[PDB]
Amino acid sequence: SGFRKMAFPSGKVEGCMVQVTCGTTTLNGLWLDDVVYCPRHVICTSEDMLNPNYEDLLIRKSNHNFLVQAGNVQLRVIGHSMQNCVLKLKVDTANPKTPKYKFVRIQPGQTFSVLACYNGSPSGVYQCAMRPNFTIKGSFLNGSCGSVGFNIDYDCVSFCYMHHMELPTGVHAGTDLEGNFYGPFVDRQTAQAAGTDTTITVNVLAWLYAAVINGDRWFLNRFTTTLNDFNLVAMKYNYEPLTQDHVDILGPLSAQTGIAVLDMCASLKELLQNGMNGRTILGSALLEDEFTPFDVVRQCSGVT
């Protein structure tokens, strides 16, 4: 028992982290097979922050201008190319520590672990969620760019995120491993609107089921609701509207606890309308939305 914001064991990703340097700029790179993936802004200068012409900047760079170091061993760069907002540096050596891996583009509401890195070295790991507005609330300082988000299915690492930017609002933005930004964000030092952030309703409900499993049941009530009535409340409180797909994914948790999804929705409704009244749920005084239904089942069954 006990519920925690648990991240994946980061070992498989640690063995992929390298340091990429181009000119005076240094960030992190991801070494899988004979390719090193990193944010394309590694080629920018102090002036090219406002409106960089990446195609024009990259033309001034040769394979020998990109310095890739894995710990203390230098990788020989034999090719370079730009794919959307990421650079792909072909190196002459396949990473011996390359795990089974996939490049996947997660949906808003899905969660992933981030292995924060500086100068190609791991500093820490934490669990994050891709917000509905496609930002992430991470912990990233200058030099952390290139750090990746991932998920693990037994032996396969699905890399979903690469860190690129911190918005003036203090939230984080980045790309999938094909260099496509999540959201409308651009890799330039310009003010960018991260739209209205909504609460991931299916995740809050999954976390309420995790709480019931662990003994925290004070919030359960004698009421039920409908999907239409619930969404009237979700709307008012900037929660994502619950769909039948969400209900279906919560099925295993409803089956495990014997509490119908619409009954759990009614508990969430009263929690939204009345608050916690100074109480806690799983050691939290707010409604947590960073555990997917999949995360709850994984943690409550011990999936390794």
Ligand X SMILES: Cn1ccc(CN(C(=O)Cc2cccnc2)c2ccc(-c3ccccn3)cc2)n1
Question: Annotated active-site positions, please?
Answer: 41, 145
302: alpha, beta or left? (left if phi > 0; alpha if psi -120 to 50): left
The tokens describing 159, both together, are: 């890399």
Alpha-carbon span 197 to 176, nearest angstrom: 20
The tokens describing 221, both together, are: 């009530």
Q: Which stretch binds its own copies (CB under 8 A): 30-38, 192-200, 261-269, 293-301?
A: 293-301
Asked whether 66 and 78 are in contact (CB, 8 A), the reply is no
Of the pair 41, 80, the CB lying nearest ligand X is at: 41
Contacts of 274 (CB under 8 A, 6+ apart): none
Alpha-carbon span 12 to 177, nearest angstrom: 16
Question: With binding defined as CB under 6 A, does residue 144 bind ligand X?
Answer: yes
Question: With binding defined as CB under 6 A, does residue 166 bind ligand X?
Answer: yes
Question: With binding defined as CB under 8 A, does residue 69 bind its own copies?
Answer: no
- Which of its own copies, ligand X, none has residue 8 at its interface (CB below 5 to 8 Å by kind)? its own copies
- Which of its own copies, ligand X, none has residue 180 at its interface (CB below 5 to 8 Å by kind)? none
Single-letter code of the amino acid located at 20: V
Q: Which stretch binds ligand X (CB under 6 A): 107-115, 181-189, 256-264, 296-304?
A: 181-189
**Measuring CA to CA, how many Å separate 280 from each of 217, 268, 275, 285, 291?**
10, 14, 10, 5, 17
Binding-residue total with its own copies (CB under 8 A): 53
Q: Which of 4, 9, 49, 184 forms a contact with ligand X (CB under 6 A)? A: 49
The tokens describing 76, both together, are: 């020989």
Question: With binding defined as CB under 6 A, does residue 188 bind ligand X?
Answer: yes
Q: How far is the CB of 49 from its own copies (least distance, A)?
A: 17
Question: With binding defined as CB under 8 A, does residue 286 bind its own copies?
Answer: yes
Strand partners, 288: none
Residues forming the site for its own copies (CB under 8 A) = 1-11, 14-15, 115-119, 121-126, 128, 137-141, 143-144, 166, 170-172, 214-215, 275-276, 278, 280, 283-286, 298-304
